[PDB]
Design a protein around this nucleic acid. Structure first.
Lengths: 57, 131, 141, 185
RNA sequence: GUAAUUGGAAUGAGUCCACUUUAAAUCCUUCCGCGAGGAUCCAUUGGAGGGCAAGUCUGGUGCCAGCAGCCGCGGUAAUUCC
RNA sequence: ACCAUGGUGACCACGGGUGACGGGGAAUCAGGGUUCGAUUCCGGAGAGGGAGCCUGAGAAACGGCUACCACAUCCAAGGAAG
């Protein structure tokens, strides 16, 4: 059919639970600003690429 | 003892209250806050008196330590120190005695006396037996 | 044109005050029949009880069923339909639960493709609908 | 009723629109080149710099010979000449209207103790102020946003209570003296 | 910045004697003693198509479930759901 | 009491509404405005709803009285106190 009133939660009930894995903790506060000022400005990129964004794949 | 310096400023004597009042600033670099029993015996050897009429209070320490400051004064008689002195700082030392009941107790006693008219043969012992 | 002369401030002021009765945002705020008629009665939230799990069809561009309820308010009791804005949270609610319906976003107009709903449900059975989604809180045993 | 004070105001201001890409990169390089904690305390000094220019540009719309901009204006000059953001030589109503945000972040205690060499690595200077190591003349201060005046600008040093100016080391060295002395010599 | 090895006249949150504070108290300040290597002494709330800063990475679902203030996204390779 | 027939109104009387206590003020901000002010300051009003009084220099008082209306208290049923 077209899903009238049953299967509420149809896709959350059958999504496979990939586990949440853990990482070393994030530097918070004033140190958080330090480690991302240093990633954007004092790290000048050697190559071109039309200034591709900070989340490229 | 080593560095506990007792200075003062804004000194005044007034014979309205028969007192000598001043602002006391205590210089102590590496100690905690000096007690008031430590202070008032040191003004006695500065002002040529005995520590029975020196009443000090209100010491508050600056951020970082060192200079704490409070207000203090000296009377001219311990009889003067019992008349024109508020009763709490007279009692910090053992010169005044204030052991009353709580004001919850005193207020219920007052409204119980109010309901009993006239008789000294019942107002005095109005419900004092249950103890 | 307009009347400009100095001393016509009775005419300019009395004409401005009865021409403000011709837009929405003055007249729905200053007449009184637009606040006697909304179900919250001049409030941002209201409690009510669940009457019927209902499903409404989305608009023609869309094709889905939106999971809604039929809240009947515990204050000045009157019927609304309200949306349960989550994935599986039609199942966290059941018959005659008490809920806290909120506004749906744009003050008495529907948002999105849900035809004729005006409210959304938060806080079913005194626990939050987000907390039941994330699992920070459970339904009361 | 009450004997309460009742007066408070906001020190910052939020921008007119968010997420404009040229603003938050030129205001990132203030958060990191002077090593501040969050962008609210850049909005702090920007709102400081705002109302000074508010007052001053409202003075510049007035001519020559009256009292009130003598009295407000001469005061405004001597109050920010004594703070170090403007020099004592050229104090005018003209030159305050070119005064920038970078001239106020310099006069903080947080970067006047990096450029006097009591700390390297500007982030370390917060880790010395707030962690109780730096005094103004007789008063230790753990507040990095302390805007230091030009008069008491030479007398910044470590405290006599500090590890770096005085004595009685803290618990981390004193643990290290005792740690090999638990069962041995 | 990976990745550390460490350690150092670093320190607080906490714990807790003593003064100070106060009508009496507690706080804040002052100062013994302990108290930091996943410093596990753990930072969250929202977003990531456009407006509007940030992914056409990977799996799952297949106009369903849901998202989306607005335009819109989903019908078997979804940069928009889970 | 005896007389005269007047007063007010499209420059909005009169009636109705107010989710109306008034003001000092508060948020906003090119100027001009728009909105809020129950709320520590001043002024007013009322102590369940009306009404009538005592005393006092000052009250139509309510942690003063009296009566009706509304609600409610103890009782040994006769009464007492809100």
């Amino acid at each position: 059919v077209h899903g009238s009133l049953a299967r509420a939660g149809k896709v959350r009930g059958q999504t496979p639970k990939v586990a949440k894995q853990e990482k070393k903790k994030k530097k918070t506060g004033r140190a958080k600003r330090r480690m991302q000022y240093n990633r954007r400005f004092v790290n000048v990129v050697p190559t071109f690429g039309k200034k591709k964004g900070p989340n490229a794949n | 003892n080593d560095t506990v310096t007792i200075r003062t400023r804004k000194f005044m004597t007034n014979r309205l209250l028969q007192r000598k009042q001043m602002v006391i600033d205590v210089l102590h670099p590496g100690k905690a806050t000096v007690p008031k029993t430590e202070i008032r015996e040191k003004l006695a050897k500065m002002y040529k008196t005995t520590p029975d009429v020196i009443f000090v209070f209100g010491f508050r320490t600056h951020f970082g330590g060192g200079k704490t400051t409070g207000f203090g004064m000296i009377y001219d008689s311990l009889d003067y120190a019992k008349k024109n002195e508020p009763k709490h700082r007279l009692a910090r030392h053992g010169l005044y005695e204030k052991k009353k009941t709580s004001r919850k107790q005193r207020k219920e006693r007052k409204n119980r006396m109010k309901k009993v008219r006239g008789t000294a043969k019942a107002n005095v012992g109005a419900g004092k037996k249950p103890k | 044109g307009k009347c400009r002369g100095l001393r016509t401030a009775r005419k300019l002021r009395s004409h401005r005050r009865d021409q403000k009765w011709h837009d929405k945002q003055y007249k729905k705020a200053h007449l009184g029949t637009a606040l006697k008629a909304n179900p919250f009665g001049g409030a941002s939230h209201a409690k009510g009880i669940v009457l019927e799990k209902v499903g409404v069809e989305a608009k023609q561009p869309n094709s889905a069923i939106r999971k809604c309820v039929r809240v009947q308010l515990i204050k000045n009791g009157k019927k609304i339909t309200a949306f349960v804005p989550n994935d599986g949270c039609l199942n966290f609610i059941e018959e005659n639960d008490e809920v806290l319906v909120a506004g749906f976003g744009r003050k008495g107009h529907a948002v999105g493709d849900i035809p004729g709903v005006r409210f959304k449900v938060v806080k079913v059975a005194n626990v939050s609908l987000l907390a039941l989604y994330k699992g920070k809180k459970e339904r009361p045993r | 009723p009450v004997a309460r004070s009742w007066v408070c105001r906001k020190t910052y201001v939020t921008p007119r629109r968010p997420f404009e890409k040229s603003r938050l990169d030129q205001e990132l390089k203030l958060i990191g080149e002077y090593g501040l904690r969050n962008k609210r305390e850049v909005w702090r000094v920007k709102f400081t710099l705002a109302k000074i220019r508010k007052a001053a540009r409202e003075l510049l719309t007035l001519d020559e010979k009256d009292p009130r901009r003598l009295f407000e204006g001469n005061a405004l000059l001597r109050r920010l000449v004594r703070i170090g953001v403007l020099d004592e030589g050229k104090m005018k109503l003209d030159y305050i209207l070119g005064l920038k945000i970078e001239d106020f972040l310099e006069r903080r205690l947080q970067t006047q103790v990096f450029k006097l060499g009591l700390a390297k690595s500007i982030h370390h200077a917060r880790v010395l102020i707030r962690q109780r190591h730096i005094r103004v003349r007789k008063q230790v201060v753990n507040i990095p946003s302390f805007i230091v005046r030009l008069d008491s600008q030479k007398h910044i040093d470590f405290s006599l209570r500090s590890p770096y100016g005085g004595g009685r080391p803290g618990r981390v060295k004193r643990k290290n003296a005792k740690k090999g002395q638990g069962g041995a010599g």
